[PDB]
Amino acid sequence: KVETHEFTAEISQLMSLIINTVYSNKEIFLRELISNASDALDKIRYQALSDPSQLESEPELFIRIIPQKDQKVLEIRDSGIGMTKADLVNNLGTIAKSGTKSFMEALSAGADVSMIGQFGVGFYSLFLVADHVQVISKHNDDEQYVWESNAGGKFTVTLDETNERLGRGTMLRLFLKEDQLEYLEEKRIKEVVKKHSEFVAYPIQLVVTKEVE
């Protein structure tokens, strides 16, 4: 049962700006998305100070990076607060207008694309390295949904009947551009994290498939 929606025109233009930009340091997308994940963890951490049962859906607090070389997919999963169905429809598409106008203007004045997070639209930095993205999410006391976009004019939101259960949190599935498959590599991923994400309150886990010989 696939609900369709349309992007606000601003978000669609931000999505087209980023998915096209020629930019040298495209690796900063990873700092942005780990930064979101850290924020989403902060928020479940807060609720669990008041109410510790909130952590029972997924007791470990982590950020986890899962290269899927078979599918040319990089997955970024956190055990954060997660997002409701309505959250997905508004937080992604249908909102964010404030930061996006400011940011498009700062760029025309010379701003470095790496400053996108100061305007709080760093999520869309993912399109530096990807042309398709799925967002899977599960908030305590609500069901698991998946949100999907092609950087175009519509996005779907649909109940999640095909993915591993998150327990609680959010997982981004980046369909990497063909020029950008370096970000599936264990060494590459190690460099960017230690370079850009040294001060993260939570363990950053990298998942490596290694053949036994």
Ligand X SMILES: Nc1ncnc2c1ncn2[C@@H]1O[C@H](COP(=O)(O)OP(=O)(O)NP(=O)(O)O)[C@@H](O)[C@H]1O
Q: What whole-number distance in Å separates Cα of residue 76 and Cα of residue 118?
A: 21
DSSP 113-171: GGGGGGGT-GGGGGGGTEEEEEEEEE-TTS--EEEEE-SSSEEEEEE--SS---SSEEE
**Residue 93 token pair:** 């598409």
Q: Whole-number minimum distance, CB 70 to ligand X, in Å? A: 23
Number of residue whose CB is nearest ligand X = 39
Contact set with ligand X (CB under 6 A): 36-37, 39-40, 78, 80, 83, 91, 96, 120-123, 170
Binding residues for ATP: 36, 78, 97, 123
Q: Whole-number minimum distance, CB 213 to ligand X, in Å? A: 36
C-beta of 83 vs 193, nearer to ligand X: 83
**Residue 97 token pair:** 């207008």
C-beta of 37 vs 128, nearer to ligand X: 37
Q: Whole-number minimum distance, CB 192 to ligand X, in Å? A: 17
Q: Whole-number minimum distance, CB 169 to ligand X, in Å? A: 7
Q: Whole-number minimum distance, CB 103 to ligand X, in Å? A: 10
Q: Are 135 and 147 in contact (CB under 8 A)?
A: yes
C-beta of 67 vs 169, nearer to ligand X: 169
C-beta of 137 vs 180, nearer to ligand X: 137
Q: What whole-number distance in Å separates Cα of residue 173 and Cα of residue 126?
A: 10
Please report how many Cα atoms fall inside a 13 Å half-sphere around the Cα of residue 103, on the Cβ side: 25
Binding residues: 36, 78, 97, 123
In sequence order, the 6+-apart residues with CB closer than 8 A to the CB of 123 are: 32, 33, 36, 92
C-beta of 121 vs 189, nearer to ligand X: 121
